[PDB]
Ligand binder design. Structure first.
Ligand SMILES: [Cl-]
Ligand SMILES: [Cl-]
Lengths: 261, 265
């Protein structure tokens, strides 16, 4: 039937890296898509350390650079997982002309009427069960920035809670210190209708996500209604790990829906 | 029902790779009742150093030496080294032979005690030169110019992860980093000795379908310095821990039980 090939850019959440997309990339490529995963600053094997940045603008630079390399006339589908929802929204606001669709993968999905931090503050209000994760801080400019190193129990029980046990171990050896730069995020200008608000938004959630609850995710969906909502039975927070074929099926539908001449 | 010794395996990656490579094996060893630790060596995996900060094996190996020093008195470990990680485990055995119960070489360079530590690496280098799209570069460390490599996509797919899931190739693509064999250091180090490295039980494990360490090269290593035991894993590639992890876990467990039976006596 009708099938098109698209270019996806896949964006990890804080503490994670391009490596997280290892299962999804070959599935997308097998169907003729171009799928690109990158490390954001101080993520994955990026050689910066977190203390060298304090803002979403700096953090997101690799994504903005990549988008600037897309040829005139061509567009990309941005897929953001968890906190990578904030990165793809920032990108959409900055380069709306380059983005055909946004796909939020159990992801923070900002709106236009409140501060960019609004959904993150709600998450932080509603989930506080951080277990053996370790919170620290560092100075960046005038600010004290809060950072987190994800605990083994957090990974196994909340994040990769229905993933193969070898994926929990992989994450253990790869996750790095991360921040949500809340002071920056909460003082940034609001996203706008003509920027981030102009792009088709698809919201995909995992039925068994043990860190972004069903109520939180439905709250985000109701807060800023997307164009389509997909659900993945039995998927945990890391759909691209726990139910990757189901994820790929959905991304194929998104490409088809995004398609144009 | 009775008791037996639960081994503590320390798993050591090759150059350009990191602790992440052992993600399939660790849960199997732990599930079974053993302990298994994988660490990043300097400038590898997510270690924050960069390769230009070091120029020697002694520096490169520090995280393994530091780990071994933390092992409580009278406890011992089994060192498993893959590919170039064989050099690291040999060095550690030489430095801390009292802490090591066995060495397991996993398609790995296995030095001897009568030639320079580089001897097996120099042989590998003579016998394999098909580096395809891998990129060689160099930097200065002390008086020396050190050759470094960044593994290419075809090298990874066709030579290293050649019978592994394509997902594992992709994983490697997003994680491999610049590495070096520090050949000028390695070839000028003092030889290993019979009382150090040469005193420890050595098990040589190799994959039947390794597309970077030849059958002939692996047999050349085995015959160069005869090990206590040899295992060949059917259909495995250079990365046994990725392509045939079930079979690798079985072999390691048998090696641990052999060490458990020694203590029994
Ligand atoms: Cl996460
Ligand atoms: Cl290798």
């Amino acid at each position: 039937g009708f099938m098109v090939s698209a270019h996806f850019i896949l964006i990890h959440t804080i503490c994670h890296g391009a490596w997280l997309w290892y299962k999804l990339i070959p599935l997308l490529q097998s169907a003729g898509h171009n799928a690109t995963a990158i490390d954001l600053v101080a993520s994955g094997i990026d050689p910066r350390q977190l203390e060298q940045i304090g803002t979403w603008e700096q953090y997101s630079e690799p994504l903005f650079t990549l988008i600037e390399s897309i040829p005139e006339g061509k567009k990309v589908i941005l897929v953001g997982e968890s906190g990578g929802g904030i990165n793809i929204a920032l990108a959409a606001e900055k380069y709306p002309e380059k983005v055909s669709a946004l796909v939020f993968h159990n992801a923070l999905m900002p709106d236009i009427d409140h501060s960019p931090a609004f959904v993150y503050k709600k998450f932080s209000e509603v989930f506080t069960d951080w277990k053996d994760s370790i919170f620290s801080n560092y100075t960046y400019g005038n600010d004290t920035v809060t950072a987190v190193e994800l605990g083994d129990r957090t990974l196994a029980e909340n994040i990769f809670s229905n993933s193969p046990i070898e994926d929990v171990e992989l994450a253990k050896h790869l996750v790095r210190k991360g921040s949500f730069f809340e002071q920056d995020l909460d003082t940034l200008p609001n996203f706008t209708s003509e920027g981030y608000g102009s792009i088709r938004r698809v919201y995909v959630y995992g039925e068994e996500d043990q860190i972004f609850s069903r109520d939180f995710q439905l709250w985000q969906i109701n807060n800023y209604k997307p164009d389509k909502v997909y659900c993945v039975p039995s998927a945990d927070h890391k759909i691209q790990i726990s139910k990757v074929n189901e994820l790929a099926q959905i991304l194929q539908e998104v490409a088809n829906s995004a398609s144009d001449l």
